[PDB]
Design a binder for these strands. Structure first.
Ligand SMILES: Cc1cn([C@H]2C[C@H](N=[N+]=[N-])[C@@H](COP(=O)(O)OP(=O)(O)OP(=O)(O)OP(=O)(O)OC[C@H]3O[C@@H](n4cnc5c(N)ncnc54)[C@H](O)[C@@H]3O)O2)c(=O)[nH]c1=O
Ligand SMILES: [Mg+2]
Ligand SMILES: [Mg+2]
Lengths: 425, 560
DNA sequence: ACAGTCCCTGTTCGGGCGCCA
DNA sequence: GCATGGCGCCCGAACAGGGACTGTG
């Protein structure tokens, strides 16, 4: 009784990944060495030498409600070089469903993949090197022999199986929608939370009968609710009186806004500052001014036109630090053509660590993207490369990792995406 | 004896063949050395004489050893390496004494002819062919072909290190409690057994290797407190760098300065306060190793003060996992920072410095933050954790900062220490406009062909000014304007502008810069009492913004 | 209303040196 | 006319990207 494999043709003129390993902490290493000994015992991975010219970094993480360490490979770069494989030859289709469901749960089904053996040729590319503290010894190198947790190509192969494992469950529950994105399974229903959870518990079960494992938690809501997700846009402050400074700033936003919506008119308001005056000096809004203002304030309600998602393009996510622990982001494909826009609040049961927040925020944005387009956005992170590369792993909690990019560009547009409208009480 | 360990399979890059580079002129005297050596490696079976059919070759040569008492054969496989498959290096970093724990007993061994004890993949051997000239060069010498790891190959270092790890795997399993640091063929074995028991294991090990071909000459430290390891002197309770000898000379060449700073920087490990800033400026701009650069004022001085530090030797104390670490940093000089990590107050675990100045305009907080991050990383590499920080910065200063800077930012657990100088923001821009203060509307413009420029301001109190500029950039002018506005400003001023570029630099509260102008703007800002810069969309006809423009862009965009 | 160009700044990569082997 | 791998530092050139003029349509 043999067990087959799918050959993973790598794209022409494509070289494997060669990324140096980033230094891990005392525990991270410890746990990683253990995870690796077993995996090597259970024949999941095998030790390799330096004749193999490839590499990918790895690290570990400890999830919420969980006190077990999970190995995590950053095949992010391998994914990029193996895209035609999992996005064309064998691609998991994204159903517009759970975007709509009232509740979605995410299961770490990924462990299933260890079950199928990985092609022999493609194996060379799964190499990884474990570092040693204070460099006692030269890094140990291993490579997978089975579908690995984190490669987009793994979920591409298992598709054949996973579908069969689910035909039954999908039969008795014709309304629940399940999406498989990498190591995860998004299970969404319109049922009641109590019943929902139960159906989930039933799904976990269904999986066990087919030998699949789903890490369980120490159990101290969690699940995502694609309803309380609301795209909230720009709001022109509303005040009783107005000063030059104010009108200027207002024309600021409005001007910037005219880029998103072309309806914004600034003509009349501009007239108010017709001539060089002092800043604190007060100015009364005229008849034609007040109209225009309100005229504009109205426009900012109807979202732009031409915001049609297009799978053939990347997905870009931008985060703005609003401070006070408040955050804001926009996701788009073409400039000024936002596909969504939300915010991000404070931590419950935790502290206010500037970085960590972004980390949480980034993950937040990512799943929403998964659920909605079944694709990951490219993040433009508002933090220095080092600051971030120093601690994002220390707070990370997802099996996948987005493609980030750094950038600095202050609120020149003077708080272009936050709270402004507050008149006297 | 060669080794019984499986060879690592190696190949040349596709489409490429072996090297056929001829042997170059060698010292008749030197040759002796190689001929001597090759006769040995021959009987030992490490290399082999080869026939006429082998078309490959590669120039070889010798070089004095550690004690110049012998010679190490080297090969110039530079041409081979380029035609050889890539390898992933398994050497990730370098051990460090400060990351070492105490052990009742210690020993350190080395492997005689280490490379030369690891079999070289068979089929690859062809290309390792070379040629040894005759003592008088009458007729072709002997053509030899390596059978073991040859020095000067991409593959040797990584092959060995990987193979040397496989060898130590069994041994390591059986004695989990022994500690073995392996850098190449260099072994440091430390345990908590008794001197005698120790020697035993060491005998197992030394023998264990011997079964694998890893010979072990009696030139390995046994019962000696001063352990010579990785360039350090390892003592029972303390350690230090090995004799560090700064060069002493009247005039210096570019290269001489390098050797210097590299020496001094290697001393920064434990010798606190070492600075190479100025000394480094000497090698600014394209130069040549030979060129003889002159030691300026500072440099002469720095090298001096830096020379008076290496006078009284220092020591570092080993690592105790039983108590969290501490890293303290202080502001050395403008841009420069030095730190030291310890567990006990006076007993420095290790020291260092951080001078890298990143960016055009920054300030101290940001640089301070950089060091924190630099050390944090370096700490995880050595100890695996992040230490607690003692920083010369007001808890209040920082909070203001991270809660006002637009980028995400953070420092780990840290406590304030009042050890001057102290980091602080030198001024803050007002959140709201200041009542009853001259409101300067400022701009400037320039011709990207004539390079001429007018930077001007105009206020609500009817005051006005424009200055002409020789060769400037449309950006700088906008800067100049704000300068003028700040010069001619009062003590409380309002400045509106259309230049994000400008506005941008200023909003991050800089306290340093490579830009002359900015330092002036900086200086001027400190002196101020209540500043407030505003922004306004250019060419939008707003308030005074409209006017200044009209002015400053007078003779640069009139007609074509 | 959209390329083509310029200024300015940031990141990577290569050279030299130090240190270990 | 003199090699290899690894890390560190410093320097500067090369390449990238983003806002703002500029010219032509
Ligand atoms: C510094 C340096 C290192 N390396 C690479 C290649 C080299 N591996 N080898 N072979 C490995 C370890 O460096 P190491 O500094 O240990 O040199 P190596 O191992 O080559 O020789 P080693 O230094 O260990 O030998 P010595 O310390 O000079 O002498 C040891 C003594 O032991 C006796 N001895 C050694 N071998 C034998 C034998 N087979 N039979 C009898 N006596 C022996 C002999 O009397 C000699 O004085 O790093 C390199 O390529 N270039 C370099 O510049
Ligand atoms: Mg040796
Ligand atoms: Mg301007």
């Amino acid at each position: 009784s043999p067990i087959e494999t799918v050959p993973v043709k790598l794209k022409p003129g494509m070289d494997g990944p060669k990324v140096k390993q980033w230094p891990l902490t005392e525990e991270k290493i410890k746990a990683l060495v253990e995870i690796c000994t077993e995996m090597e015992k259970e024949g999941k991975i095998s030790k390799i030498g330096p004749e193999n010219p490839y590499n990918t970094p790895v690290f570990a993480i400890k999830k919420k409600d969980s006190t077990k360490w999970r190995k995590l490979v950053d095949f992010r770069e391998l994914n990029k070089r193996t895209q035609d494989f999992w996005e064309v030859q064998l691609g998991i289709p994204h159903p517009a469903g759970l975007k709509k469901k009232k509740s979605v749960t995410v299961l770490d089904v990924g462990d299933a993949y260890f079950s199928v053996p990985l092609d022999e040729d493609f194996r060379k590319y799964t190499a990884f090197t474990i570092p040693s503290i204070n460099n006692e010894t030269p890094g140990i190198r291993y490579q997978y022999n089975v579908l690995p947790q984190g490669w987009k190509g793994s979920p591409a192969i298992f598709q054949s199986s996973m579908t069969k494992i689910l035909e039954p469950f999908k039969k008795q529950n014709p309304d629940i929608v399940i999406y498989q994105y990498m190591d995860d399974l998004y299970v969404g229903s319109d049922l009641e939370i109590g019943q929902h959870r139960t159906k989930i518990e039933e799904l976990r079960q269904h999986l066990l009968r087919w030998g699949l494992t789903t890490p369980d938690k120490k159990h101290q809501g969690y699940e995502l609710h694609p309803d309380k997700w609301t795209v909230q846009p720009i709001v022109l402050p509303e005040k009783d009186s107005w000063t030059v400074n104010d009108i200027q700033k207002l024309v600021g936003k409005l001007n910037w806004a005219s880029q998103i919506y072309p309806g914004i008119k600034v003509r009349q308001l501009s007239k108010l500052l017709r001539g060089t005056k002092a800043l604190t000096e007060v100015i009364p809004l005229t008849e034609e001014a007040e109209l225009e203002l309100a005229e504009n304030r109205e426009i900012l309600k109807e979202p732009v036109h031409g915001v049609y998602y297009d799978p053939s393009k990347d997905l870009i996510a931008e985060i703005q630090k609003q401070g006070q622990g408040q955050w804001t982001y926009q996701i788009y494909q073409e400039p000024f053509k936002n596909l969504k826009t939300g915010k991000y609040a404070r931590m419950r049961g935790a502290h206010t660590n500037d970085v960590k927040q972004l980390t949480e925020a980034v993950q937040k944005i990512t799943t929403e993207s998964i659920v909605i387009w079944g694709k990951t956005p490219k993040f433009k992170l508002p933090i220095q490369k080092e600051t971030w590369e120093t601690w994002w792993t220390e707070y990370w909690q997802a099996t996948w990792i987005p493609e980030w990019e750094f950038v600095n560009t202050p609120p020149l547009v003077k708080l272009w995406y936050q709270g402004g409208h507050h008149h006297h009480h | 004896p060669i080794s019984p360990i499986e060879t690592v399979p190696v190949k040349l890059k596709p489409g490429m063949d072996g090297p056929k580079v001829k042997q170059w002129p060698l010292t008749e005297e030197k040759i002796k050395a190689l001929v001597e050596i090759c006769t040995e490696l021959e009987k030992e079976g490490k290399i082999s004489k080869i026939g006429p059919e082998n078309p490959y070759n590669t120039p070889v040569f010798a070089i004095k050893k550690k004690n110049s008492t012998r010679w190490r054969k080297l090969v110039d496989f530079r041409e081979l390496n380029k035609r050889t498959q890539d390898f992933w290096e398994v050497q990730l970093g370098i051990p460090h004494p400060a990351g070492l724990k105490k052990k009742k007993s210690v020993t350190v061994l080395d492997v005689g002819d280490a490379y030369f004890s690891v079999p070289l993949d068979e089929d690859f051997r062809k290309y390792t062919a070379f040629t040894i000239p005759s003592i008088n060069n009458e007729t072709p010498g002997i053509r030899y072909q390596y059978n073991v790891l040859p020095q000067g190959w991409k593959g040797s270092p990584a092959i060995f290190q990987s193979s040397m790890t496989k060898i130590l795997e069994p041994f390591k399993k059986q004695n989990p409690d022994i500690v073995i640091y392996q850098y190449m063929d260099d072994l440091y074995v430390g345990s908590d057994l008794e001197i005698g028991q120790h020697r035993t294991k060491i005998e197992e090990l030394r023998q264990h290797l011997l079964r694998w071909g890893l010979y072990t000459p009696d030139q390995k430290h046994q019962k000696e407190p001063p352990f010579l390891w990785m360039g350090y002197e390892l003592h029972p309770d303390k350690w230090t760098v090995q004799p560090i000898v700064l060069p002493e000379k009247d005039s210096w060449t570019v290269n001489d300065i390098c050797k210097l700073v590299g020496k001094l920087n290697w001393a920064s490990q434990i010798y606190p306060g070492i600075k190479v800033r100025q000394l480094s400026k000497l090698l600014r701009g394209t130069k040549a190793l030979t060129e003889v650069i002159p030691l300026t004022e500072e440099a002469e001085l720095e090298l001096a003060e830096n020379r008076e530090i290496l006078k009284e030797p220092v020591h570092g104390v080993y690592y105790d996992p039983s108590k969290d670490l501490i890293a303290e940093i202080q502001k050395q000089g403008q841009g420069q920072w030095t730190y030291q990590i310890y567990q006990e107050p006076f007993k420095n675990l290790k020291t260092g410095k951080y001078a890298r100045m990143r960016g055009a305009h920054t300030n101290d907080v940001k640089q301070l933050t950089e060091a924190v991050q630099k050390i944090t990383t370096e700490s995880i590499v050595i100890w695996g954790k992040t230490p607690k920080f003692k920083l010369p910065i007001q808890k209040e200063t920082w909070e203001t900062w991270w809660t006002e800077y637009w980028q995400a930012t953070w420092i780990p657990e840290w406590e304030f220490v009042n050890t001057p100088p102290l980091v602080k923001l030198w001024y803050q821009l007002e959140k709201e406009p200041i009542v009853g203060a001259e409101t300067f509307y400022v701009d400037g413009a320039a011709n990207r062909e004539t390079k001429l420029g007018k930077a001007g301001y105009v206020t609500n109190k009817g005051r006005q000014k424009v200055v002409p500029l020789t060769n400037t950039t449309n950006q700088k002018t906008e800067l100049q304007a704000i300068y003028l506005a700040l010069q001619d400003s009062g003590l409380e001023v309002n400045i509106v502008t259309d230049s994000q570029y400008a506005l941008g630099i200023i909003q991050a509260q800089p306290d340093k810069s490579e830009s002359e102008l900015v330092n002036q703007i900086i200086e001027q800002l400190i002196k101020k009492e209540k500043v407030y810069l505003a922004w306004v969309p250019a060419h939008k006809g707003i308030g005074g913004n409209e006017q200044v423009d009209k002015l400053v862009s007078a003779g640069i965009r009139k007609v074509l």
